[model samples]
Target chain A: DKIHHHHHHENLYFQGMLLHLSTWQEVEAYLQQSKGIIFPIGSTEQHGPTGLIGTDAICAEAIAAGVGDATGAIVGPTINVGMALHHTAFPGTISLRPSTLIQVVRDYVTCLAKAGFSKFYFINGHGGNIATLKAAFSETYAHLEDLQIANAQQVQCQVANWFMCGSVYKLAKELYGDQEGSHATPSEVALTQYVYPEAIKQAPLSPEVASGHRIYSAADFRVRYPDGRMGSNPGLATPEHGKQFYDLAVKELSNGYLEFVNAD
Target chain B: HENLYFQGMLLHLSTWQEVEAYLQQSKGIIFPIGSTEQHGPTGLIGTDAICAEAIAAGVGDATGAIVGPTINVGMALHHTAFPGTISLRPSTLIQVVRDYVTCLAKAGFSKFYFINGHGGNIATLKAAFSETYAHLEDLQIANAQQVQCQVANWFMCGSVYKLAKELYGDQEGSHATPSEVALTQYVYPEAIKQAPLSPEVASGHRIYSAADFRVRYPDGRMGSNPGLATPEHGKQFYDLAVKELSNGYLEFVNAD
Candidate 1:
């Protein structure tokens, strides 16, 4: 039964409700049933000539929201801004220093743990957010235990990348093979098209794309990938493929959340 | 005399020459500090930041003070149980505040006034100021001794509090009180919310874990009946706070 897939609601609020729309009373009640939550984390930065600057945030937010809907877990706010120091040369890009992002993550988890939520499932959209998010989790674990939050010892955080899902990677390989470059890949671009078809963009792409260059400052990044494609052929992205990618992620992450929340 | 309609002028928006000219007249600068957290079910998520920012603008307009960027997130460890809440740990915020002051202090502006809206930020701001004083002495910036910081809470203004008593009486419970909600109504009238508020609101408990806070104050309010807020009352609170903080800012800058 599809109901079995949802792991048989231990409580109604954990029966697939949004934390943002629910009241604190509902959340307080929810604490008795489950301590797991999903945080949709992403970065706001350049996403190539034909991609939205908010591509990472938008993709991560949508996918995590989908996972939340599938698994019946309360989802926290989308961290719409993350570490993008390498993308700051772009006009619309905003970034927090790694130190600052660490503090932001530490604060988020610390307070949540103090409130008794122990499982933190972060669905990440940006590669740049990973290192800093992991560092922040380490800092938060130490900080939480030090502060004597009752459930601090049980707090666990994990980052699940939709782009790296096995089904999604297999599909990307079939669709574009080696053409699926890192930053603005057709897979992520396709997902955005599926989410926001009206915002589809078109730009002339050069045959010679930048690859294998070590990333440094924003100025150095611009010099390496002049048009911000990072060797990805986003021109191959289709909204149809985006739908396939979304289903795969939702299916995989639903079980992942169940396993995490039910873990001893 | 440029039209000091300085209703809102941010430090980042001004050129170096303009700042130098402003420093010749006034050494005072205002920073609006607020928190990003759940304010009851009916209240806006941005209530604290919006109130602090609007009041800071009003005070800046009245006193010709250069307002810095709003510290939109502050210490709200107690409110993290609900979603859409963001916070800086007390320590993180202390460092952030120090960095902000150190930069501005080095630029030659000294008298720092923080128009704070959230109650949670007070202790940390005080701690940060002490840390800053020591750090400034270590660096020995030329005008280190001249640097001073003050937090003027608009909601705590004598006139504002007294008026809230006259209006909402005991219904004016602290956390998402009608007074602050009314102030936000004055600021963003269109975004006012309408939701089914339960008659029973939990209150009177010492804050601990996010889980405990949720259990103690279920609706995200602390005995507050924000249902009593009105835009008209909001205008009154706004006027009183702006006037009071204007005087407070003046007194602070002119002090030894």
Candidate 2:
């Protein structure tokens, strides 16, 4: 368990496959052998008074990189802004409407597909991205096949959710019990702790925390869950728990990556 | 064989300089968008694209309008599960449609005439065109107010449909009609497919998922019988569509 490893390639987790990082020559070479790439999509929105405003995107990027590194896949640049229209009333929350997100996804995918990466895997950190991502994938496949691209029939894609991993779920339940509510949960908080240990914070937890509110707009969300603790006490998270969750997610997703690449 | 100019005057195949010079004379550009989904048994997966592209090129020849690339995939979500059937959600197709028009409108092309082959694209294409008009106005580019789009269905051309009715009668079904298949033959004779069509094809049931479509129309056909389509009929239908759509295009250019 204590084995340390080093790779000559770029730090796949922190840097990602940002276009700025590579030259045309490198991308062309990378495309020649592997026609697959991973993109980490996240949302920039408020977590809570105590939690940093960047929690969701931060977690998504971290987990995306972990999976990319473990699987030897090229990760595309992080999509920092997602369909966060539900959370846009907040000061820094930037969102694209579902329609806009569909276009962004199409444009990004189309350029890559035309340039020749057919297998697209998105490791989504936020729950809001699921429906839109699926919709975009459907649209892209059809678009490509319609263009009559050389290998249009071979295009395949999938999205992996780190939070949904079985091991992470079991650990969250065991560690936080009833306190682990959906949004801004202790487990995700803990993972962020491991990633950025210096920024752990604290705020007042009035005895009655809001929960069970159906999500609508950012204003509605803030009013419903005033402290933004859907019922979870992120006070329960620790750096050690964060590391454990991170490890489990990377392992489970490595298996997922292999399954996707090996499938017909 | 010597007569078919299948590719049309698609702008992408033409150089940018060629287009810039053409824009000096004509404000109209033709775009063909079609579905890349199931079209019954015997109909190739690319049937809609084939029909639209061929017919669009024919219209382009007649009107002298610069034709853009064929938007092959369209809104066909319900046809997803079938092996060769691919589709985009209506919202997504709307975005694709918007992007295409916005790009051309920026280059001084004002009139966007979409020669659409697939029925599913109509609603979304209209939606996209509306959104695009607002978007261009917002971007506040020069000549933004003049952009307009129209969908010219080649198969539905009054002359083309009447001939199909006379030649193939009720055998010309909607989804995979002998009329369309015959036109493809006239255009791409080398890629012509010959297969045994169902003696009794499914006539009516609303289409849903790819699974449902396959089940409803088992051999992948609607009421049409492609058996009636002949290379000769294909040529006649092609000529009729070209002539009619040409007149339509010329009128469109001359109109407001």
Candidate 3:
């Protein structure tokens, strides 16, 4: 059960078989030793004025690849669009309803379970995917059992939010204090900057960013958080902070996954 | 293109390049659509999905059309009150169908034929087709005007329905009919269930909320008596559906 414990700079680019790139034979070979796979789930929505549209996806995928490198588990395709129903008023924001996401999750799990993989660890980047993801797990368990697949009882799923890591949270509190708004936080922006420095952007952020608003429909969200900055300042984010957050997430989730796959 | 043997002949098993090549020869695809619902007291939970997938495979074998993945767990919102039932809201299924077709159409394939096994999937699928056509025009996909989707219900096929009526007469009621149960038997004989069936059953009621549906049909069945189903009748239904649907697929793909 000992997977590699080393991490390199290009782990996402060139380590541990990616589900999209790997051949069926490679996947079959992998299945003999382990039934665990990591899925990086994130949203494709507007991340304020100075952030990439794919900030959540990019962060989750990069960190998931890092965790996969450390644990040698096969990483699956990134679920780029998530339950961002409230963000649909913005351009380029794609979302699946909570009900749809459940089916998508069930379909993915059923396909992989048919191929002999059982443990599903979703490295999540957006907070919005949590409730729906939990709902999907419940739906998927009943579904697999209904199909009566040979390994149905053994199937297990878990969602690990990278931004919620204890070390990352502590650092965010120390760095930005109350300025760390939920939607487009500096921590996420900084991580994107570290990933793509050339694409790092600069824009004037208003002092009065919207905060503490209940999200209902897309129209309501757009009116509540105009310009898409929730109660944060991205100007203070630096590339160095991004690296620290990435390292902390990789280390913590690596241990979390090790314990998960080893659990009964 | 050679490493497409992932699991059976599914579109996902093939690479993008393989799909591009498939577009040159055939522009039609068969998607087996079904629902995860309680068929009846004795019917297996996977009855709809299992039937649709098997029938679609048969059609694919008959005609050289590419078969996409099986949509197990379709729009069955009314079935959610029962155990082992998972349903996507009608709105969700429309989007999911839109996405699947969008991806395939972008790859240059059109003429989507969904061989359905459940009655509940038809209305939503039709709605999804309407939404998808507008979506393709919005995205302006190549050959957007050429995309066509048809929901062919195998259980309602003329030959199959005639055979069911001839075989079981009034016992071939809507929900968990003897025809569908027999088809499942022909497909997977070992999984046949044995349970007592009440002579009195509910039928001809409008489908409403999950709670209302459970209250209406207590044993998760309509007026059908699956106790009348046998593997032999299932074979007849399967053969009739495959032959009739093969013609339907060819006609849809050949039309201008």
Candidate 4:
């Protein structure tokens, strides 16, 4: 009699399950069935010369939508911008200050909690947003308790990184072995390619890409990784590989979502 | 000369290349800061955010500046007793403002104009600017010394205030006044709500805890009669705020 059993119908598209598209009455009805909501958080930054500026956001949004469709969870809006201060040197990069992002997360969670939602699942796309997201959750928890809301004690938040999913990680390692550098990896580029085939870009990438450099200021990052890529070769990405990554991420996160909502 | 009234330059929708191009012409950006707090019985929970965003968009259209994302939540700890109200702690909000300004300043945008909608956010926003000023100087970003931040409250705009006083007089209780309700009604006509409001509502209580405030003002209103609001009045408020804020933005951006 797990909560997952309640949502075992035919698969639907994420757009059909979006909270933003829903009315307050619809959301109120949804709360009666499940208190869980999913937020797709990603970054707007220069992935690489060959990658789209919205690679992280595109991948996260698509995957989160797929998971929503798979699990019947209400997907909230796509946080198209994230914490990417180091990438600010790149013209297309937009980032929320870590502190700002934390407050944003807190505000979003607090609002939802007040409306009877207790489980906050953020399907994250960028690694840079992790520490801040965790900090935001702590802030939200304390703030909620202080507000003395009835559901404050029951509220829980979790950040699930689709890229870091066990199956997704294993597949990435197998498909693009050492080429999957930390930032702007082929796996992510491929995921974006699959989600937005029309936006697949082509550009020359140097054979020797910079890696292992310590992150500092935006200027330093530009100097260290001149082409806005770490040790990855985005040239290896393809739409087909992106489909594989997307499927794997969706499956893994769907299971993760079910487990989180059904837990004590 | 650039088309100052060319309205379609939202930062979220613009690509980085477009933003870089915009930076070449103007280092100014508008951010609408509001609260997701309860606004009395008949007011929408999103009233503040709704009003601020609408006016900020109009200002951006008039000034040809890049409008950033709407900060839809702010410092509203006093309003948290209301179920729909959501607030960021003052400390958290200060850091939030600092982060927003710092990120943009690093990217070469110097003039920061926050078209604020909530009174609760003002004190923290001012604190955040001072905190941000020191933070930028510490970061020593190329244009740190040149960055300037200003919070322009649309509700406090002289023209808007004068009109609100003329429209509702003492009946315009501060928190969920007819002026703001009217503005929200104008922005979202479909979401306008009708509820039974008491003939005699609480007023003139100094701010206290969320619980204390709730106890003092039962229906979540401070002193205003939103029943007097109409969509037409909302439109009037919108026009005045947009005109005044547009002028204010120009003055801020063109100064020093």
Model 1's DockQ score: 0.10
Candidate lDDT (C-alpha), each: 0.78, 0.70, 0.78, 0.80
lDDT of 1 by residue, A17-83 (tens): 5554444555666788889889888875677777766677777777777788887788875676678
Give a tens-digit lDDT track for model 3, residues B1-256: 2321111233422323344456777888898887756677667656787788778887777787767656766777776655445566677788888866765576577899999987889999999999999999999998999999999999888999899999999888888889999998887675677777889999875898888998998877888899999988888988899889989999999998
How many residue pairs clash per model?
A: 5, 2, 0, 2
- Every model's TM-score: 0.63, 0.52, 0.55, 0.73
A180-246 in candidate 3: lDDT tens per residue?
8798899998887776664567667787888884788878888998877788888789888988888
Highest TM-score among the candidates is held by which one?
4
Tens-place lDDT digits, model 4, residues A1-264? 111111211122224466533434455567889999888888867776777666767777788888888888988756767899899887657677876787788777876797798988899999989999999999989999999978999999999999899998898899889889888899998877666564566667888999884889999998999888888988888889988898889899999999999999
Q: What's the residue-level lDDT of A31 in candidate 4?
A: 82
Clashing pairs in 4: B173-B223, B173-B224
lDDT of 1 by residue, B1-256 (tens): 3332344344423323345567787888888888767878778666777788788878887778877656667898778878557678888887777766765676677899999999899999999999988889899988999999988888889999999999999889879899998988776666577777788887674788878987898878998899999999998998899999999998998998
Sum up the clashes in candidate 3: 0
Model 4 chain A: weakest 10-residue lDDT segment is A1-10
Q: What is the iRMSD in Å for candidate 1?
A: 11.5
Identify the CAPRI category of the predicted complex in candidate 4: incorrect
**Per-residue accuracy of model 4 over B1-256 as CA lDDT, tens digit each:** 3323355466644545566778888899998888767777787766777788888888887789888767766888888766545677888778777777777787799999999999988999999999999999998889988999999999998998899999899999878899999988786566677778889988895898888988998888888899999999998999999999999999999999
- State residue B104's C-alpha deviation in candidate 2, in Å: 1.6
- Fnat measured on candidate 1: 0.12
